[PDB]
Amino acid sequence: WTATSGSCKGRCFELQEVGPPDCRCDNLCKSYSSCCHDFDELCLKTARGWECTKDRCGEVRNEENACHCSEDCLSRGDCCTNYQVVCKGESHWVDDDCEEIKVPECPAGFVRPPLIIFSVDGFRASYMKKGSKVMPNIEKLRSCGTHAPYMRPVYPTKTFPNLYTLATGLYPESHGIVGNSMYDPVFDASFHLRGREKFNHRWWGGQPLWITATKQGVRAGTFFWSVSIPHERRILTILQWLSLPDNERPSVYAFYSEQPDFSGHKYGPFGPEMTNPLREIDKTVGQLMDGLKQLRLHRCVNVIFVGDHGMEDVTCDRTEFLSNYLTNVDDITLVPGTLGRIRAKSINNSKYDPKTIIAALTCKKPDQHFKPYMKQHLPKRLHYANNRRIEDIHLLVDRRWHVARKPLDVYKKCFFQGDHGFDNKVNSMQTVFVGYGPTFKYRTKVPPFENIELYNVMCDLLGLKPAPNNGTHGSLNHLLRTNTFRPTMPDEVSRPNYPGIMYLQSEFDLGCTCDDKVENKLEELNKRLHTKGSTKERHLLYGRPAVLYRTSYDILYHTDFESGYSEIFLMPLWTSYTISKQAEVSSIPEHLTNCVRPDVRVSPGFSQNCLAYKNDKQMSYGFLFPPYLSSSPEAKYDAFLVTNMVPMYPAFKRVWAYFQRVLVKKYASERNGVNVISGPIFDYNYDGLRDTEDEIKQYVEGSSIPVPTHYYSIITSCLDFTQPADKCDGPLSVSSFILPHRPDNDESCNSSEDESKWVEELMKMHTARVRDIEHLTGLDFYRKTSRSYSEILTLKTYLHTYESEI
């Protein structure tokens, strides 16, 4: 109930929300069915349209008009946006040459440059080039301001998850908006696009920018607009708020357009019907910039033109049906479409079994257009697991496809020709970013970046301290002329030990053997030099990683590799080695096939043992520095040390051996040498963060050897590939991955074939940022380079996507 018989007179688009049953007049009252009786009349005036005409110039103010062309309109803040153009000989903003905005040029009384966020739904990245002819205002912002070729959304590449990520800098698993549609079980409640539940604050976690601003005394325009409020009216309302007295005027505003998403669903991303919605968005930008110019604010406000996700060609005939795979199809509930999420229809059903549902959907048709995952097995770069609203079973759907439960769901629920939601690395899902204004750089292109980074920058633009978030603060400093945040490297928490030779061979009882008893002060001083770190500058090119938590670990030096060996987890946390372009691959000599050697620098009590691997019928082992890449037959013995060994399932050893034997050398050949850092990851609670020892759910049978959930590698070389990786004078280039450590290769439908047909495709899917590995390990990389820290932060957020050119 609302006693909607008060009035909006002098309260139109009021900024403080009123509590029931006093009637509301804010830009969201329609959506709550709570506006005062006279809201349309007073606040949604439409008379005479949105543009001044010659004959309206100097008119007598008629308060009925949607906007004004009267002499007093500028000081009242309510002229039509084209007023000065039509009535005062002025040019449209788009027709003016751009001129560098070196300092903010604001009216007296402005304490900071305002921020206007202009968001556009479904604005795919390639529209910037493909629609350029019809979007002159947008093309001017882009070419004169700061822009990226594209901006990566979050997964799922849906509307609410991405808009709320923009607002909070958090992954959807952390902010809680994990789809356009969701079920929470603690609430026992459902969130839907239509309906009232989506309004309860309990869905919306984190701290969005408007709240961050408000808490720190920066005033915010209300961000959300009722759908029926036309765009011209949203623009005029923003412009009117910008004319409020200093103590009442907000510093941050949002505009939102439903286009081009709305038409894109109907006509597909490049349908001929799409030219008009792009024209109409551009004209709205034009109205904003014209209105700002009239108010002498076009060189004062920072404008962000940003999309939430792109749009792909998707039609009814490209739908996979779970009914074609499953017999129990009514014992399940499917969140369908461009992703799939599956749960049990009834929790009173103890017959329900996820493992047989997964098996029933795995590699069942040759051209199958989705792949099932338990959520913890999804690629870690998606960060899509640590929420009770994300169902244990997930379907990653091929681009251009849908998944549904039964065919009846599709003809009783072809309309649509476009949709979105797919893996956030898919080119069609990429969206846009342009920053224009005194705080952004002038005519500057920046590399593609992720939308989780923008919250920190918007905070910087407004002088706010950001709430804790998933951006890497400083990684987008290169977007900014001023207001940069000067990040600093985290302090190392644990310092390493540097053990020397402290144990005799016979003190070990590990059940390991090696055929290594083949017996010179030339090569004896030399081997001693290597063990003390004489070659360390070669294999550790960016300094040793810092350990950011409390633990006990040793640095171990070798001719070919250096490692930081954990006495707690009984294996390296990291192993670092360089492979030059000229390096040679060799085989494991026959006599050394099962060779494992005690390490006389490390106690029996802090070592793994071979007997546990013998007894564990499921678990085998691999090596972090690969024996295949040894620099000499003598150095090869170092690779068989028990301190270089890690637990590996045989199914996983297929992947790992191919990477180490074939792919490392291929990368060194292609990139002119590479530096590799590899190691284990433990994330048994799938929160994206390093596990403590008490979180480990799996050990090599009968031992305290913990089993990794994943294995990572970070592969760095010179951006200028004419310089070898080990003598690089400038910026670096990196690709990384986090491979799931799985006891089968069910994820790879082609795994019965030779590794050359499936391994690299798997590794591509599990591409990762350095930063993702940092969260998962408590390590901090690139501590000693010749590069500025902000550049290194950019490097750490880089993701190698393997997509073709946009």
Ligand SMILES: *[C@@H]1O[C@H](CO)[C@@H](O[C@@H]2O[C@H](CO)[C@@H](O[C@@H]3O[C@H](CO[C@H]4O[C@H](CO)[C@@H](O)[C@H](O[C@H]5O[C@H](CO)[C@@H](O)[C@H](O)[C@@H]5O[C@H]5O[C@H](CO)[C@@H](O)[C@H](O)[C@@H]5O)[C@@H]4O)[C@@H](O)[C@H](O[C@H]4O[C@H](CO)[C@@H](O)[C@H](O)[C@@H]4O[C@H]4O[C@H](CO)[C@@H](O)[C@H](O)[C@@H]4O)[C@@H]3O)[C@H](O)[C@H]2NC(C)=O)[C@H](O)[C@H]1NC(C)=O
């Ligand atoms: C991406 O960035 C984000 C943000 O920085 C990172 O997320 C943070 O990670 C921290 C570590 O996991 C986490 O810190 C914990 O917070 C607990 C208090 O949490 C509440 O308060 C905060 C602050 O206002 C609030 O933001 C939280 O919001 C969550 O929950 C609400 C509703 O419950 C949601 O609306 C919201 O979306 C959000 O949900 C997300 O996070 C939770 C976890 O909090 C997930 O479960 C959800 O799925 C979802 O992802 C909360 O309202 C605090 O109680 C914790 O303290 C325990 O552990 C510490 C260790 O220091 C220990 O000292 C304590 O003793 C304590 O243990 C006790 O409780 C245990 C659990 O009940 C129990 O087992 C013990 O036996 C003890 O009784 C802890 O400090 C922080 O909350 C989140 N923040 C957010 C917004 O998610 C994220 O990690 C980054 N991701 C990556 C990949 O880097």
Ligand SMILES: O=C(c1ccc2[nH]nnc2c1)N1C[C@@H]2[C@H](C1)[C@H]1CN(C(=O)c3cc(OCC4CC4)c(Cl)cn3)C[C@@H]21
């Ligand atoms: O058309 C859609 C829609 C629905 C389902 C779809 N499937 N596929 N495409 C779809 C498009 N919808 C839903 C709601 C409503 C209409 C729009 C207004 N809204 C906000 O006003 C907002 C703005 C927000 O933030 C804007 C700030 C961050 C910059 C946030 Cl967080 C949430 N909602 C987001 C959209």
Ligand SMILES: [Ca+2]
């Ligand atoms: Ca964890």
Ligand SMILES: [Cl-]
């Ligand atoms: Cl969804």
Ligand SMILES: [K+]
């Ligand atoms: K075994």
Ligand code: NA
């Ligand atoms: Na397989």
